[PDB]
Each structure stands twice: as structure tokens, then as C-alpha cells.
Design a protein around this ligand. Structure first.
Ligand SMILES: [Cl-]
Ligand SMILES: [Cl-]
Ligand SMILES: [Cl-]
Ligand SMILES: [Cl-]
Ligand SMILES: [Cl-]
Ligand SMILES: [Cl-]
Lengths: 74, 74
């Protein structure tokens, strides 16, 4: 399980046992926006998995724009 | 190639060796949006990794809104 550092910005619920967690992480002088699958524990809280990406802030707009475009498929 | 699978919507360059690929695909009549770290083999032979997420399109608005928030705050 990934090291659970960083500030949760938003938790998007996938199911009773999974969420997509969007968080800020600071590491070695540098901030990242982390987007990661997290899974439920025995106490109703969630634990981060390795299935996630870490995005430097200057790439966020492009990731947003790509998702906006992906929303038009259907 | 990581670009074989479904439709590439966007290809966000991280470095010469890594990109974040946002793709859309269908299987058995269900839609999948994928956001995934892809890494060089050689050439444009980028290859996918497990560092990604796979979501249903009904979660897109929430993910987008979370990333917009992450861009503006903290
Ligand atoms: Cl939690
Ligand atoms: Cl994992
Ligand atoms: Cl980056
Ligand atoms: Cl892009
Ligand atoms: Cl669908
Ligand atoms: Cl999903």
C-alpha cells in the first residue's frame, strides 16, 4: 500500500470498497497532485493502492482538458 | 504500443520517457475512461503501467471537479 502522506482534496466514490482519491503531496521540495485508487479497511476507512498517478501541478490543466474531451465520447 | 488500445483522447507529456495517456474504450457495450502512466520502450513504443485508474463515465464530472479544486486551492 502506498505511503499515505498528503492532503485529501476530494474522494470520488466508486463502490462500497473503492474510491478515487485526489490529494496534494509534497516531496523533496516539490508538490504533486496525486490521483489514486484507494480501498476500504476493516474500520470503514480507506488505504491507498499503487494504482495511481502523480501529476506535477503544471500538467493539471492538460489532464483536466483531456477528461473534459473524454466526457464527449458516449 | 500503449496507443493500440481504444481511442487516445489526450497524451500529456511528463518527460521524454513518460506520458499520461487518457483513453476511452468500449467493451461489451460498456464505456471505460482510462488515465494511465505510459513509459518508453523505445520510439513511440510507450507501454502502459499499473499506475493508472479506470472509471465509468458517470464519475467523470466528479473527478474533473476534484482536479479543478486541486488546481485552485491548498
Ligand atoms: Cl480514509
Ligand atoms: Cl495495487
Ligand atoms: Cl509530473
Ligand atoms: Cl495534452
Ligand atoms: Cl457505459
Ligand atoms: Cl468505476
Amino acid at each position: 500500500s502506498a505511503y499515505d502522506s498528503g492532503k485529501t482534496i476530494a474522494d470520488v466514490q466508486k463502490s462500497a470498497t473503492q474510491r478515487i482519491r485526489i490529494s496534494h503531496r509534497w516531496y523533496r521540495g516539490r508538490r504533486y497532485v496525486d490521483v489514486r485508487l484507494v480501498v476500504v479497511d476493516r474500520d470503514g476507512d480507506f488505504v491507498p493502492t499503487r494504482q495511481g498517478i502523480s501529476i506535477r501541478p503544471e500538467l493539471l490543466a492538460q489532464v483536466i482538458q483531456g477528461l473534459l474531451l473524454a466526457s464527449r465520447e458516449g
